[PDB]
Every structure is written in C-alpha cells, then in structure tokens.
Design a protein around this ligand. Sequence first.
Ligand SMILES: *[C@@H]1O[C@H](CO)[C@@H](O)[C@H](O)[C@H]1NC(C)=O
Ligand SMILES: *[C@@H]1O[C@H](CO)[C@@H](O)[C@H](O)[C@H]1NC(C)=O
Ligand SMILES: *[C@@H]1O[C@H](CO)[C@@H](O)[C@H](O)[C@H]1NC(C)=O
Ligand SMILES: *[C@@H]1O[C@H](CO)[C@@H](O)[C@H](O)[C@H]1NC(C)=O
Lengths: 369, 369
Amino acid sequence: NSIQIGGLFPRGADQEYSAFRVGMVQFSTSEFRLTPHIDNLEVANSFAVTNAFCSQFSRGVYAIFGFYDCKSVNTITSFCGTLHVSFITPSFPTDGTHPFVIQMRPDLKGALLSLIEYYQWDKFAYLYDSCRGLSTLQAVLDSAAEKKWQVTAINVGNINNDKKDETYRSLFQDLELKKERRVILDCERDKVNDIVDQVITIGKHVKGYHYIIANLGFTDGDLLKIQFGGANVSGFQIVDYDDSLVSKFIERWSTLEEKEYPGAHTATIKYTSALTYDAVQVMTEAFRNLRKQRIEISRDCLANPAVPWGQGVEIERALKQVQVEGLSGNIKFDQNGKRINYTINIMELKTNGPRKIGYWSEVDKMVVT
Amino acid sequence: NSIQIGGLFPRGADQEYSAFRVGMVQFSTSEFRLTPHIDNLEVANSFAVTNAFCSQFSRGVYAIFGFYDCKSVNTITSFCGTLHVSFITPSFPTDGTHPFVIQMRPDLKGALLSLIEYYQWDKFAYLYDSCRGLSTLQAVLDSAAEKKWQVTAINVGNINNDKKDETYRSLFQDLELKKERRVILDCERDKVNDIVDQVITIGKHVKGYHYIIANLGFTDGDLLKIQFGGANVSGFQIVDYDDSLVSKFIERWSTLEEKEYPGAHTATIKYTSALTYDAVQVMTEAFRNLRKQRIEISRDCLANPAVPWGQGVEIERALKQVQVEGLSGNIKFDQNGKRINYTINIMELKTNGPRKIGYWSEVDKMVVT
Ligand SMILES: *[C@@H]1O[C@H](CO)[C@@H](O)[C@H](O)[C@H]1NC(C)=O
Ligand SMILES: *[C@@H]1O[C@H](CO)[C@@H](O)[C@H](O)[C@H]1NC(C)=O
Ligand SMILES: *[C@@H]1O[C@H](CO)[C@@H](O)[C@H](O)[C@H]1NC(C)=O
Ligand SMILES: *[C@@H]1O[C@H](CO)[C@@H](O)[C@H](O)[C@H]1NC(C)=O
C-alpha cells in the first residue's frame, strides 16, 4: 500500500530534492512507501503554483510537500483550505493561522528579538528585502515602540535593476546620518554580500560593524564565504552538528555522489534541505499512525468538489500530532501547524570559525554558552 | 457590435456596482455597447478570485474590470500577465510594474510624504492595518531614515479577535512613552473609529492630537461621522466637488432611487465608486479608439493557451493611451498603467466642515490654498 503525495519543488532546488530522495529511502518500510509525483516550477509565479497544485489535486494526493514565495503563499493557503489538502513546507511561516498547512520551519522572530536584547542594542538598522523581511521587521517595530529602540529600517530590495555606490553608498550616507554600526540584514545572500562589500569599499570603520544575519542557516555554505572585513557577525542555526542524528546523517550525506545526488557530498546541508528530509519523516510517521487506526480511505480543482472535509482533516491532524527528532531537532507542531518546543542555536563568527554562544527556546528565551 | 467584459465585484460593494451601471449608461452609444458579465465574490479569497477570473477567460472577454485585496493581488497580477487579459481596477496600486493591469487609483505616498513635510512633523506615529498600510509605511520609513524622522510604526491590525483597552490602551502606553500626538492612521474606518474612541476614553489631551488619515476619501460619508473630540484631522481627496463633471454627475446621482440604484442618492460618492465610473469611461474610450484603427479582432485557464500576446497587448495599450477628464480629474496612465498627471486635494476638518487647504500634483509637490 503506497500513499501518493505531491512534490512542488522550485526549479534549481537540487540539494532540497536530493535531501527528499534520501529521506524517502531512509524512512521507507515493508509496511508502505510514499509515491511522490514531482513538478518543478517558478514558485514565485502564482499561476504556475495554482496549475501545479491543481494538477496534483486531480491525480488525487493525500498530501503535498512543497515550497512557496511571498507572491505565491496566499495561493497555497487558499487552495489548501478550500480543497482540504494538507501542504507541508520548509518555506517561511505565515503570521496568521491557516488550515491544511504544516509549517516545517520555526519562527525566528522570537530569537531575533531576544538577541537584540542580549546585545543591549537600542539604536540600529534593519535592511529588509521581501515579505519575509517585512514580517520580521514588523515584529521588531512593534517592540521598538515598546522598548524605545531607534530603528532605521530600509528596503534594500526595492531598488530598480542594479544597486550601486549610488544606491548602496547613498544608503550609507543615510546610515552615517546617525553613525549606525549595529545592522540587521534580512535579505538574500547576494544582497548581504553586496551591502557588506560597500562597507568595505567605503573603508571606514569596517571592523567596527556588528551584523546580525536573520536566517536559520549561518553555517550553511555560502554565507560565511563573504568577506565581512573582520566585523562582529551573528546569526542562527537550527541544524546542530553536535547531535547524533545529524552527524550520522552527514557521514552518509558527504559520501554520496553528486551525479546521482546533486548538491550532496558536503560537510553541511542547507536548512531548507534538512527541513525537507525532516518533512519526509513527519509525513511517513503520520501515515503510519493513520494506518494504526486502520484508516485509508480513498483518492479539476475549479469545477469538481473539494476533498470532503472529514477525510482531509484526519490527515491534517495526523501530521500535526507527529512528534519526532530529526535534523532540525525536536519536531512538534501546535494546533495551527506551527513548530513548537524547538530550539535555535545563536552563533557568532569568531577567528576560529562560527561558534555557538548560546541557544534560544520556544519554552524559554536566550540561554548562554 | 457589443464588446464583452468581465466585472469582478466584491460582495456588498453596492455603491460601486451602482456607479458602474450608471457609467455604463452614460458612455454607451449607437456605435457599440460594452456587455459586462458579473461575478460577486470574496475578493480576499485567492481561490475565489482565480475561479472567477477563469470563468471569465473561458467566456472570452476583451477586458476585466474588478477589485483585489492584499491576499488576492498576486493572483490577479499573475493571471493577467500569463493570459494577456487586461485588468482595470480601483484597487490599491502595486509597488511594482505589472503588465496587463490598468490602475485607476492614484498613488497617495507622494502626497503623504509631502504633507508630513508641510506640517513640519519629525516625531510621529504610523498605525497600519494591512499590505496597503505596509507599502506606504515602507515609503515613509525609507524617507524617515533620510530626513531623520522618529517614527513609532505599530500594526494595529495584528490583534487577535477584539482589540481592547488592554490592546488599544496598551498601545497608548507605548505612544505616551514619547508624548506622541501626531498620528497617521492607515486602517479601515472601524479601526480609526476604535483607535480614536480610545484617545477619548483616556481623556487626556484629546484636542491636542493631530491625525492624518491616509486614504483618498476624506469627504466620502463615514469618516467624518467619527467623533474626533476636536483634534486637528487631515486627509486627502481625489473627487473635487467644485468641478463641473462632478457637480453635474452628483445632480443625477442624488436623484436616483436606492431600490434601483443601491448606495446612490447621496451628496457624495466613495472614491472607489467614482473610480469605477471613471473606469467605464476609460474602457469605452479605448474600445472606441480600437475601432478607429479598424481592429476587433476575436474572442479553461489552465489547459488552454493564453490570449495571443499580440492581440492582448493592443487592448492593453489602447487602455493606457487613454486620456480623459472624469470624476477623479485628469485620467492619464504611464507605460505601466499607473496614473500620472493627477492631483490630490489636501483637506483639514475645520469647524465649518472639511476644507481644502491645498493640493498636491504628480508633476509638482504640495501647493497651498
Ligand atoms: C564586537 O565584538 C567584540 C568582542 O567581544 C566586542 O568587544 C565589541 O564591543 C563588539 N562591538 C560592538 C560594537 O559591540
Ligand atoms: C521538548 O523537546 C525535548 C527534547 O528536544 C523533549 O525531551 C521534550 O519531550 C519536549 N517537550 C515537550 C513539551 O514536548
Ligand atoms: C492644530 O491646529 C491648530 C490650528 O492652526 C494649530 O494652531 C495647532 O498647532 C495644531 N496642533 C499641532 C499639534 O500642530
Ligand atoms: C495635466 O492635466 C491638465 C488638466 O487636468 C491638462 O490640461 C494637461 O494636458 C495635463 N498634462 C499632461 C502632461 O497631459
């Protein structure tokens, strides 16, 4: 008895797909196997996403694993909720409550505000790039009001075509309007590189900067290849390499072959990819526990009725009731498919590389060394 | 020769639909008539919007008139651009460039920043409610950085269920953490009422507040029915009642019958509704000028190919090339379907009612009396 699922992958998310195939192997059994059907697509494109989702709906699928972007998230949330098909995703978690959405990624906002407190910052910059940026920004601004922080929040993303000395050094005239040194960067890695390169070209106070990078993959590959010119650099990490699961997993990961398993074979793995492998565990567990109650039951998105609410909700609740350890640590979901009981490691870039200075917990706030 | 169009109306946008039927009459001729097919729907619902749009696409339509919301705007922009069907809309204009979208509504951000300057504000609050709020907020924050304004930006919308003294008076503890009196309100009218009512209950400095209401209908009906307790209250207005078109139009508007023309019969008209009537002019003009070059040509959104790009783009350009005077004044569109050469009247609430203290122009910044 194989269970059919969707896979919505962004074009060129090779590592993530590789992690998926791996997880597929690792948590398959005699008892059953998940059979995925994969679309690769421009996830920013809402028409593209609608169309792939419908295609999957009409094959009949028990769940969809997949990704969204700022532009497409409402398409997913709406089609999920309308059609009672569960979507599991490493993508950014939505502010709101949204049924039929299992959110593999934990929420950084908590940690980010705690970190801001810990470093005793009260006058700083926030450079945002996209809805992910905004949504965290908002939480910050709401607290800025409450703790009287002085935030200079700027939208680095909203630059037409290239961003130059003309824009970025224009930006550092605005930032050197208050001698601003503490900086939060919530942008794609290229922007981080491009912004930081500008601090360097300008050539004043380069080592004096303290950057916080607001994502969960500090020690994924490409970030720490940026020349930060010796500034203090902090960040976050959900895949802890001192864990047994992870080190075990990484032994296998680094010895696979790129030709067969593209983006594999590295010391580390992108959180999106780890969350993907974790997702596969979460899915198989919930179908396992669905079989423990002896349930199955059975398998055009615009004309034909939705999956009956009662059938759909039992799959949703199975997914949300799962509790496991995987690469992202303790996987557990609240009523809304948001992760709970998770911890996020706080990281600083020291001479000898990136070092955990502490963790943050959902149950508890920042804890040291 | 009748031309077929879509009408996507939000459920309970009666005035707007009434304005549409009126405009339909007013700018119909022997030469041709537009035949609209109407869906009424939850425009916040992306699945609802997709489905109505597809339904229209598959009837074959030369254009769609309609509305979107924060949640649905990307569905419209994506399906428009994918399918080469022009969408005309009084809804909030998008930051970006988006093909096949004709944006009837002018952009307030310009005026809002100019107004903020004129009043020589440099420490103030911004209470936002939704993407419309955010997108303007962003423009403000970007300039705040540049002019060293001290903005306390708070998300009044993101309150679970009811907002109380517990939230709103919690909010006025955060706002009386800097004796904040200058306030920008970018929220639905109920929030405006609810926020202002709280200033009143608190009962300190009530007349000392200065509110700016960030929308284009100051002198639409319901806003000025709020008890502002004698504070300075400013705002914006695109329908100028001293114009001839408008006064002529209003003579007719107030003498129609509610039973036949619901939300009609009032002294004033909501900008969304005026922009609707203006839209109808814009559409008929562009089909008129399409007939001047002797063009027609001819009439499942997920399987079947799009409207051929070359057919579609000639309708788009016709719409964008239109220039007319209607209720919103000088209607003219740039390359991206954004309004240009528009003016926005600046308004203050005085004892003797709302009075134009000045206008702002796209060509020029704030001008007095
Ligand atoms: C950067 O890190 C060093 C190392 O502890 C610290 O002494 C310094 O104060 C930090 N810079 C700022 C601006 O806090
Ligand atoms: C939290 O996670 C730890 C290990 O990560 C686990 O032992 C514990 O049961 C979890 N707590 C809850 C409330 O599930
Ligand atoms: C409110 O308007 C009055 C009328 O001109 C003005 O004198 C006063 O300064 C305004 N209040 C503020 C806080 O600017
Ligand atoms: C601007 O609008 C005025 C009247 O509203 C009109 O006379 C003028 O032609 C317009 N300017 C441009 C550049 O179209």
